Amino acid sequence: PGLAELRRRVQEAGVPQTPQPLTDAFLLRFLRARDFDLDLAWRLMKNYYKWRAECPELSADLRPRSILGLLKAGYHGVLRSRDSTGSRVLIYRIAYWDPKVFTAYDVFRVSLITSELIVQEVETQRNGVKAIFDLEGWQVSHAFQITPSVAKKIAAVLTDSFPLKVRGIHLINEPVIFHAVFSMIKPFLTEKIKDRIHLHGNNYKSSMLQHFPDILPREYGGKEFSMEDICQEWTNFIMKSEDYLSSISE
Amino acid sequence: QPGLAELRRRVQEAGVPQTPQPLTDAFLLRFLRARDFDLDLAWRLMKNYYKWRAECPELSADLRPRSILGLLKAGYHGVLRSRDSTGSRVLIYRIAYWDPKVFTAYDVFRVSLITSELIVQEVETQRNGVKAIFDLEGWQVSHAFQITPSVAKKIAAVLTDSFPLKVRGIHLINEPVIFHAVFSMIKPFLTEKIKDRIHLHGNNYKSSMLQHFPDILPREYGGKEFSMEDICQEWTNFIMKSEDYLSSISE
Amino acid sequence: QPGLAELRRRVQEAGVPQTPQPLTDAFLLRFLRARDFDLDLAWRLMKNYYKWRAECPELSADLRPRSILGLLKAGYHGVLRSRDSTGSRVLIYRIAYWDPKVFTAYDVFRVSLITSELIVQEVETQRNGVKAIFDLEGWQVSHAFQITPSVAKKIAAVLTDSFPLKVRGIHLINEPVIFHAVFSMIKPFLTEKIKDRIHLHGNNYKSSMLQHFPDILPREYGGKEFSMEDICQEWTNFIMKSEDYLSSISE
Amino acid sequence: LLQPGLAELRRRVQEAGVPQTPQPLTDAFLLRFLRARDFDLDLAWRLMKNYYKWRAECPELSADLRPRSILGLLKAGYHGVLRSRDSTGSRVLIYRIAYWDPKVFTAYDVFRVSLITSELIVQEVETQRNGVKAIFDLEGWQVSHAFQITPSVAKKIAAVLTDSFPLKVRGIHLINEPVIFHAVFSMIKPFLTEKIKDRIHLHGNNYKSSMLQHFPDILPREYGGKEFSMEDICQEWTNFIMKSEDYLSSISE
Numbered sequence A: 001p002g003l004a005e006l007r008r009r010v011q012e013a014g015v016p017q018t019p020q021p022l023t024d025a026f027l028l029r030f031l032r033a034r035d036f037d038l039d040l041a042w043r044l045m046k047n048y049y050k051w052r053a054e055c056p057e058l059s060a061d062l063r064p065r066s067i068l069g070l071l072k073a074g075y076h077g078v079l080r081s082r083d084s085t086g087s088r089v090l091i092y093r094i095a096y097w098d099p100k101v102f103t104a105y106d107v108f109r110v111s112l113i114t115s116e117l118i119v120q121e122v123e124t125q126r127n128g129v130k131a132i133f134d135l136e137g138w139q140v141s142h143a144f145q146i147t148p149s150v151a152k153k154i155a156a157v158l159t160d161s162f163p164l165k166v167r168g169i170h171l172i173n174e175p176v177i178f179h180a181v182f183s184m185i186k187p188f189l190t191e192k193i194k195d196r197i198h199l200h201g202n203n204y205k206s207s208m209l210q211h212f213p214d215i216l217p218r219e220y221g222g223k224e225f226s227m228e229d230i231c232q233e234w235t236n237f238i239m240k241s242e243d244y245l246s247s248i249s250e
Numbered sequence B, C: 001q002p003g004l005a006e007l008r009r010r011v012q013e014a015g016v017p018q019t020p021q022p023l024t025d026a027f028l029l030r031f032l033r034a035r036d037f038d039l040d041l042a043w044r045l046m047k048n049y050y051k052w053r054a055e056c057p058e059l060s061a062d063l064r065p066r067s068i069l070g071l072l073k074a075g076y077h078g079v080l081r082s083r084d085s086t087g088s089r090v091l092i093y094r095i096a097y098w099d100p101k102v103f104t105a106y107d108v109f110r111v112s113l114i115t116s117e118l119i120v121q122e123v124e125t126q127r128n129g130v131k132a133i134f135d136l137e138g139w140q141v142s143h144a145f146q147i148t149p150s151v152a153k154k155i156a157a158v159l160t161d162s163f164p165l166k167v168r169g170i171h172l173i174n175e176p177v178i179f180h181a182v183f184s185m186i187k188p189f190l191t192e193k194i195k196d197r198i199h200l201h202g203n204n205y206k207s208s209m210l211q212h213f214p215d216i217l218p219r220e221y222g223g224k225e226f227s228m229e230d231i232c233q234e235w236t237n238f239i240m241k242s243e244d245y246l247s248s249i250s251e
Numbered sequence D: 001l002l003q004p005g006l007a008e009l010r011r012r013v014q015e016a017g018v019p020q021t022p023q024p025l026t027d028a029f030l031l032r033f034l035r036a037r038d039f040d041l042d043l044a045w046r047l048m049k050n051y052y053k054w055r056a057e058c059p060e061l062s063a064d065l066r067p068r069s070i071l072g073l074l075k076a077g078y079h080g081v082l083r084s085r086d087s088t089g090s091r092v093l094i095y096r097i098a099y100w101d102p103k104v105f106t107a108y109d110v111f112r113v114s115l116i117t118s119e120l121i122v123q124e125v126e127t128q129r130n131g132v133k134a135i136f137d138l139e140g141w142q143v144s145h146a147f148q149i150t151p152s153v154a155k156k157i158a159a160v161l162t163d164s165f166p167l168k169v170r171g172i173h174l175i176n177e178p179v180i181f182h183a184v185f186s187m188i189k190p191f192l193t194e195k196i197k198d199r200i201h202l203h204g205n206n207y208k209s210s211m212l213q214h215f216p217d218i219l220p221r222e223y224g225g226k227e228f229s230m231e232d233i234c235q236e237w238t239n240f241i242m243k244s245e246d247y248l249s250s251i252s253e
């Protein structure tokens, strides 16, 4: 169908054949991220490659060892269950990011690594992801790291530049500023990615439980497992996938 | 009363405007009561009162309520029938009923000036001061445009030892989270004491407010005897009842 | 022309509304000439043009000038009698003669929307593009009042691949410094290209503007031959003589 | 040979019980306050009480005036003073943000540099008579600087300059200010007296000619002069501070 077109276009523009094999599976990432709308999936593919060549410091190296320290510290875990809509749910925790040891680029890379791992799941291509950022422990040094360059790339990676549907961004324990940072974007923003950005603040337990019943760690309201558990499980996973993360590295 | 005879002299010797507010004992006592009969502080307070009055004629000269009656009618302002448990008088201001395409920040300030002028006659109010509740539900970009740096100063100035009323509490409810950032920037410029008297309750104000004002708030805010519409109407009638006294103290 | 036949085909396949603009050979060209005859890019624009037309009915539906005639009469907007050294059409907007008490942002928008549709007809203006000048002297808080976020996105979208005209220059003069503050934050969310084509000459413009548009500016900005007055009458005479054609392309 | 208000000021200082140390209450000292207020006894006394009030509220700024803790900042080229006075006898002080590394130095360290310099120049009768003008070159201004200027620092800055230091502020000139500073300035303008508002100058990126009017013939090459560089006057001032390090100890606690 539109897969027949996509491949042809890919040949024509001389889309880099490496490191990712241009398989049918890989092309359906783009098709699925755009509900099989050919123009749109192709525009995304182009933006994907465009973003990678602009950012070799981020895109070229997906090998996890360089950031093993950050995984071990407890920055990042992925829930064992999908949410009610088939989304994968990812958790990032600022407290467990030493801004002295890891730069914003190192932290970004974590997400890139996780994204590349979860994009292979057909269910995840279909139902996208939801990212939770627990901002407790937010410092001034974290902010320092978030430059215009970095802000811009955070945007693109959710602005038609990576084959994943962002179904929701949840922030908990954000400092007051984030709301100012955000009151000045709410009405500036589209209607689309505005029903998907949730600032829960300090009093987050109840609203978090409404979006993600029966599947959250004890820290955020659940009762089956802890953040430390899912951090280790996702880290074990990421390491069990280091050969694959090399195969798709420059 | 301690210092009334001294203040009487100072007032003459300094040549304080004898009109429009006539220098009755009851008038000079406001200043004494406002500073717990400490003559010096009272005298400093009275000089500040006049200094502000002369630097903001566009605010102090005219206390005739008719210009702002539309605003009162719209349900912007009311005063609770009861005093709080420490004798304070309690004023309620509702932002949602200030239509900033029809009334400026000056019109709104003038409403607080009218109300303050009327309540300071109550000895109990002079003794136990005042508390103001600001309901910021419905706050607009358009309200903010009216709060110029120039208006911010005049607000601050009247509150800085320049009106004969003890400020016992400022309560915000339903404030936009921005109000917290602005607060952080202001805090170091404020005394310890006044900081302890500013409360930002948020959208979940109901139970934290009920601790400061049990039994007296209107139904909208957790009370159960009367409505905001009633106290607005009551206070509106009262301002207009006083329209002549207000004109008599107007330049 | 390379892709002239091809484009119509895609339009016929998508069934793009037959009217109010008839899908003539001349009307399609605009989108090709806008994207240097790039078949894929011409299309995207044309999709986004109709896409933007349906999102903002209250802007794109009516292009009848007579609603804004008084705004034109006031002398808000003018266009140079000559093209620039690159063939761009130069457009001037003077905020001073926009009365936010009489005309809204949607109204002032409509003026630009009318001028644009007229000048895009001209082959050369398609090819070389357009430069805007915003004489922001006389800027008031009641003007920013009208530039809502709801309007800011509608403004930005118009310039964001949603109209068949080449933005070749945005010049701002007599900016209230706060315009530099707003521009700081739009920088990251801007491509390198149009960033260069944006100029903030400030209070000192005469020299910086002269090197961009010599021989062809009006006296107010360092010309000689005519005045803003003249070209506001002429450009007003032109939009009014077009009122018939403007009606045909309305709904 | 009697200075107006001097003998009275001494007695006011005695009735109040003003701290004898670290700064001895010599006539030379009292005169700072008198001259700062054109020999108006009352206002010089208000001023002197304010100086002492602000010192107690900011001991982390006021106690240590020893130069060695901020020597690194001076070596870096942050601060200089012009050899010449301007045409009305003011000492002219130049501060350069670009040479301030906020990783190494806090706003308090920076603030202390001004306090040292101010304490040295106040000893000059001419500077007591004709005040100071200060040029802040904000080229290089970073987010990391911004974050050092908390509301608390903003207040302490405000307070020092509000009737609390015996130096006449005769001009504040900013060059290469980010646009933000104009917004901030618009917000505080109502809070400022007319006389001070007319003494604040934001010159921008194109400062060259505008600054040349206030300070002809006397500026460094970097700002349109011709006789010396900023590097020269930074080093000359560093050395001067360091040769004053003994006096600076004697006015510390």
Ligand SMILES: CCCC(=O)OC[C@H](COP(=O)(O)O[C@H]1[C@H](O)[C@@H](O)[C@H](OP(=O)(O)O)[C@@H](OP(=O)(O)O)[C@H]1O)OC(=O)CCC
Residues within 6 Å of the ligand: A128, A155, A156, A158, A159, A160, A164, A165, A166, A167, A192, A193, C189
């Ligand atoms: C650089 C300028 C800043 C900006 O624009 O931000 C918007 C950005 C991007 O939003 P979007 O990429 O347009 O959102 C996608 C979004 O990424 C994608 O997931 C959506 O698919 P789906 O969730 O509806 O299945 C998809 O739906 P449509 O193509 O409109 O049908 C879009 O809504 O959203 C970001 O998540 C917010 C971070 C600031």
Ligand SMILES: CCCC(=O)OC[C@H](COP(=O)(O)O[C@H]1[C@H](O)[C@@H](O)[C@H](OP(=O)(O)O)[C@@H](OP(=O)(O)O)[C@H]1O)OC(=O)CCC
Residues within 6 Å of the ligand: B129, B156, B159, B160, B161, B162, B165, B166, B167, B168, B186, B189, B190, B191, B193, B194
């Ligand atoms: C941006 C500049 C702000 C500033 O400079 O503070 C000025 C003003 C200060 O209000 P005050 O006049 O100091 O408050 C009086 C306050 O008005 C008065 O009621 C207090 O007496 P009492 O309530 O305890 O009897 C009285 O206590 P003391 O006489 O100082 O012991 C004071 O707290 O505070 C205002 O509430 C500003 C709020 C935005």
Ligand SMILES: CCCC(=O)OC[C@H](COP(=O)(O)O[C@H]1[C@H](O)[C@@H](O)[C@H](OP(=O)(O)O)[C@@H](OP(=O)(O)O)[C@H]1O)OC(=O)CCC
Residues within 6 Å of the ligand: C034, C129, C156, C157, C159, C160, C161, C165, C166, C167, C168, C170, C189, C190, C191, C193, C194
């Ligand atoms: C909410 C999103 C806001 C946004 O980002 O839009 C900004 C827009 C972006 O620039 P552009 O309108 O996409 O620029 C076009 C531009 O519209 C078009 O005229 C240009 O053609 P030409 O003038 O170079 O021949 C064309 O050149 P290229 O095809 O890229 O080589 C493009 O650069 O530039 C605006 O004109 C700036 C106004 C603030």
Ligand SMILES: CCCC(=O)OC[C@H](COP(=O)(O)O[C@H]1[C@H](O)[C@@H](O)[C@H](OP(=O)(O)O)[C@@H](OP(=O)(O)O)[C@H]1O)OC(=O)CCC
Residues within 6 Å of the ligand: D131, D158, D161, D162, D163, D164, D167, D168, D169, D170, D188, D191, D192, D193, D195, D196
């Ligand atoms: C957020 C609130 C900020 C604020 O209020 O600060 C006011 C402060 C007070 O300036 P001052 O200490 O009064 O200034 C002196 C000023 O220090 C002194 O030089 C002036 O004397 P002279 O130089 O003209 O002889 C003297 O003249 P007057 O005797 O008071 O008329 C004053 O202008 O001025 C500061 O320099 C702040 C500048 C940004």
Ligand SMILES: Cc1c(C)c2c(c(C)c1O)CC[C@@](C)(CCC[C@H](C)CCC[C@H](C)CCCC(C)C)O2
Residues within 6 Å of the ligand: A104, A105, A107, A108, A111, A112, A115, A129, A131, A133, A146, A153, A154, A155, A157, A158, A162, A164, A166, A169
């Ligand atoms: C494909 C993909 C990537 C690559 C991704 C995310 C998502 C949902 C994706 O689908 C979420 C996070 C992000 C954009 C990287 C975040 C990196 C920074 C350094 C984290 C630290 C601090 C943030 C300022 C905290 C809040 C950010 C949210 C508003 C996104 O990485």
Ligand SMILES: Cc1c(C)c2c(c(C)c1O)CC[C@@](C)(CCC[C@H](C)CCC[C@H](C)CCCC(C)C)O2
Residues within 6 Å of the ligand: B105, B106, B108, B109, B112, B113, B116, B130, B132, B134, B147, B155, B158, B159, B163, B165, B166, B167, B170
């Ligand atoms: C004697 C007296 C006056 C005269 C007075 C008040 C009080 C408590 C008094 O005792 C409180 C209000 C104020 C200062 C007038 C404020 C008028 C403004 C324009 C209201 C609109 C919006 C404000 C952003 C609401 C928040 C107010 C607090 C931050 C003070 O007038």
Ligand SMILES: Cc1c(C)c2c(c(C)c1O)CC[C@@](C)(CCC[C@H](C)CCC[C@H](C)CCCC(C)C)O2
Residues within 6 Å of the ligand: C104, C105, C106, C108, C109, C112, C113, C116, C130, C132, C134, C147, C155, C158, C159, C163, C165, C166, C167, C170, C172
């Ligand atoms: C096709 C087209 C349109 C339709 C257009 C413009 C250009 C260059 C076009 O090519 C420029 C002006 C604009 C966006 C009209 C703006 C409407 C408002 C009400 C103007 C008033 C004030 C603005 C706050 C000025 C800022 C915008 C400039 C920086 C461009 O309409």
Ligand SMILES: Cc1c(C)c2c(c(C)c1O)CC[C@@](C)(CCC[C@H](C)CCC[C@H](C)CCCC(C)C)O2
Residues within 6 Å of the ligand: D107, D108, D110, D111, D114, D115, D118, D132, D134, D136, D149, D157, D160, D161, D165, D167, D169, D172
């Ligand atoms: C006696 C005295 C002191 C003590 C003084 C100054 C002057 C003129 C004095 O006479 C000027 C500077 C100041 C207030 C210290 C400022 C320290 C800050 C941390 C500098 C860095 C950045 C500021 C954002 C620069 C702009 C400030 C000006 C608008 C004053 O210290």
